Design a binder for this molecule. Sequence first.
Ligand SMILES: O=C(Nc1cccc(S(=O)(=O)N2CCN(c3ccccn3)CC2)c1)Nc1nccs1
Ligand SMILES: O=C(Nc1cccc(S(=O)(=O)N2CCN(c3ccccn3)CC2)c1)Nc1nccs1
Ligand SMILES: [Zn+2]
Lengths: 249, 271, 319, 160
Amino acid sequence: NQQLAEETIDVTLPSRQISIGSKHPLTRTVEEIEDLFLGLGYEIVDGYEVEQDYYNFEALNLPKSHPARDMQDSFYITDEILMRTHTSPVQARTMEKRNGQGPVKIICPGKVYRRDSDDATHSHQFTQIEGLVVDKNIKMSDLKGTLELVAKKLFGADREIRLRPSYFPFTEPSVEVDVSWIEILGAGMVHPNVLEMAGFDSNEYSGFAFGMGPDRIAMLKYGIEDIRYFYTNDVRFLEQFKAVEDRGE
Amino acid sequence: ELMEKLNQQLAEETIDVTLPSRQISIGSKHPLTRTVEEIEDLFLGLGYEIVDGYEVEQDYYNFEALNLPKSHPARDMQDSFYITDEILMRTHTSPVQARTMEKRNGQGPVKIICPGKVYRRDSDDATHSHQFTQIEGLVVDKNIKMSDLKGTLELVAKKLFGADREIRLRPSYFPFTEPSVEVDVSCFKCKGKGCNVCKHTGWIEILGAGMVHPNVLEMAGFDSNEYSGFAFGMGPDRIAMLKYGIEDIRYFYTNDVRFLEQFKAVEDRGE
Amino acid sequence: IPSSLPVFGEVTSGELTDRQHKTRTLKETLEGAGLNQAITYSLVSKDHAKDFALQERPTISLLMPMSEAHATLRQSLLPHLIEATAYNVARKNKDVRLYEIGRVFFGNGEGELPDEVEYLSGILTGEYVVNAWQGKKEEIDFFIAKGVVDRVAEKLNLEFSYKAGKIEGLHPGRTAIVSLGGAGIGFIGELHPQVAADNDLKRTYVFELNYDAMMQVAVGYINYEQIPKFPGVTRDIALEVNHDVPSSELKQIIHNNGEDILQSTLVFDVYEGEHLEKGKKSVAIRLNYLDTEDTLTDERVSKIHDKILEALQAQGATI
Amino acid sequence: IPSSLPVFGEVTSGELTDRQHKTRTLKETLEGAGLNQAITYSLVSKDHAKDFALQERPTISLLMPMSEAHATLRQSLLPHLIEATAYNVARKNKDVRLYEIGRVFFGNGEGELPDEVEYLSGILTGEYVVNAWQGKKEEIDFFIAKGVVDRVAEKLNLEF
Ligand SMILES: O=C(Nc1cccc(S(=O)(=O)N2CCN(c3ccccn3)CC2)c1)Nc1nccs1
Ligand SMILES: O=C(Nc1cccc(S(=O)(=O)N2CCN(c3ccccn3)CC2)c1)Nc1nccs1
Ligand SMILES: [Zn+2]
């Protein structure tokens, strides 16, 4: 009677917050790409961050002579061991263990290292997702198809993309993809020396591979102005990434 | 000044770290939801879509579209919860597959998974609930064969009961499928020669399946001279009961927290 | 029959839809806050079927129930969640936190399929945090129930608002209507003392939300904004106001007058007692000011702050 | 170029491993308790590389560091988590809850690849619970840090 009137609350007063942590935006972009590839039958594979030059370079078609293996550009620890410069060595090692038997269809996320000064667009440690498909009649159209799915997952389906011939040691033919223009994915048909070295028969098996950089994808997607924000862990940064996302309206 | 307070801290501030931690409580996922999610995961990685639709359904989709003509012994007003002569609580998740099939206008592939609540006009007890959960699947494409069914049902039994699970296919009859089977998993308890779970049989029934019947394809708008299909169903309630030794179905629908809060943690495959 | 797997020539990546994925993430969030997933019967008794319903909408009854208690489709998740709470409490499970996502059923007149609507609901009673040996015992109250409904909105990237509402079966004094884009989507409230007493419960809180409404909102991608380069300025105010003015009202007045720099507002204290005219309360509010493009001069702040004070004063809110 | 997708005649369900699944799950449960996922630099000063090591093992130093800050691989996740916390506090974020899962590195010496070990760590300071109008202010103490570890073990079905 008065009970109900005396126990009147102001229901608009601050609620007792039960706080939510955030998933790192680099991790978000990773997971999303994994989930895409899971549903196509791929395996996500994880490997060593400190690698042999065989796996990081040699197995990737970068012989002793190559500008890529320059001690000035990579973080060596001995002449034979280095902070890996990409997640390709996990893909090269996974291939060899398959023993000439496909299909391989793997996605390899993780931290990669580049001997460089850090600034707003360069971190000496950054993230990468690589993928590898090896199977009997893989053709570049198959690559193109997969790349459009990746773009569609990252930036939505109406987002305009651009495919440009290019060149990498470990693939041929090769491609770069821009999104409307900004580069995001590098990819190609795996070079036969690369199949041949990890014990596939390049007369039977073809392949395609790709890399992209979640640090860069995320910066682009959100307009994050400095890559180092990812590795500084200011909570005013991280807390902007609590919520779900949809495609949109 | 500072070293003096640092030291007094050091001397004063020792705690018994074995004391109860300040708990940050986790709620549970319902055991029925857990089983439903792992089956979805399995199917997602194979290219399927997870599809939901109506729980109150029309006779046409629940029955007719599924090759139970107005005649049939299952159309039975006593076995099913009707609301009118035409509209009933769905008895399985098939009507959702039937409707999705129909909207594909005779074009494949169809590959869908439909989890959800289903209803039987039944008194409840340790082994019957009038509202239970089902997961159906439907795959329809051009050369679908019964060996393709088998291979898929096998991934299902592995997903639920372990990498070493085998399956067994026993002849049976359902109106919507043909050939039809009931499917056992080998017992995950006793390795062979029998225990109380598999009832000293070695084999536990967990699924029914079959090749979709032409009439069902043709009614949906598909050409059964070019398209074939398989479909299957399973009961998360039964599965979870078998999996965990839960002894009474109604424990799922009572929401005793001393039952629920048992199911907080992750699982794996042990050795 | 040998064993094979179907090879699909239309290749398509299997993925949760957006709604499906949001629902899994949401259930992770609820669970992460201590709430157990309930699963209840859809069919209730015919006199329960309209409990907590929003619209008068017709109910759907079976032609031949197996059981008077399962005869009509619920128009609300709460009746069986309240029962499950009563059940638990009578078993001396005093701390009950449950949520459900589940459908409710409104009749579409005769011989049509009803409207099936997905709801998120839950119910809460007992302690939220306990550690006896340290004297910690946080009883579940309306505001922690609010905190759960807010954690929902936060995770889904939505904003809800709250306004006192009267819902039969809830405490008239501790019931809020929850709104999204100005539309009512649900409510949060303590159970009516009489309903709780019937069920032998203590202080118990439920919330029910139209999850379909929630899921229709397209949120897009997260909006990242760089961290402000410049520090803001905080002023506190203590506003004497008639006891029934909701704090939302004062916050709105402040935003309405806060021009470009008023960033947010936080009530940090409410005082009702003898040190203050009866029928008045004093509400203390922290005003936070911020320019992303410049540093704040005391004088630029004072100019607006004075405007805000006057608007408040003229709407009956004494400093 | 035609756009196509490769059709694998050898059919497999793409799924997270058991370990991958526990990880995603464990992360949600951490986030659920209010911890933000941090990602830190693997390379620390040679001087910090052995901090909190369990563990008396050789560290792994770069031949040619670019920075003294980033010269040697960490044997602990905390130095850079503490660093991030200090940073936040200096920037007046008083409430910092971070967890990280990431690797630390132990020398196997002698031109062998190191032991890379996945660690779960985190760091906590400030208030855990506030609602000031109600006078709720629950400071993070040792037994809340304990609750977080117990929630980890709870979730993974481990007995610590
Ligand atoms: O072939 C690949 N991946 C691949 C293909 C093309 C482009 C890229 S990318 O954009 O990420 N890249 C990273 C490396 N960059 C380099 C590195 C050295 C030399 C030239 N350029 C170019 C951009 C990755 N890896 C394989 N692993 C096993 C077998 S094949
Ligand atoms: O065909 C199915 N499902 C299906 C196939 C076989 C076995 C089962 S089952 O084990 O769950 N079943 C459930 C129903 N039970 C019934 C139902 C009606 C009559 C007889 N018995 C038997 C066991 C389900 N769905 C389709 N949707 C669209 C086209 S085909
Ligand atoms: Zn057995």
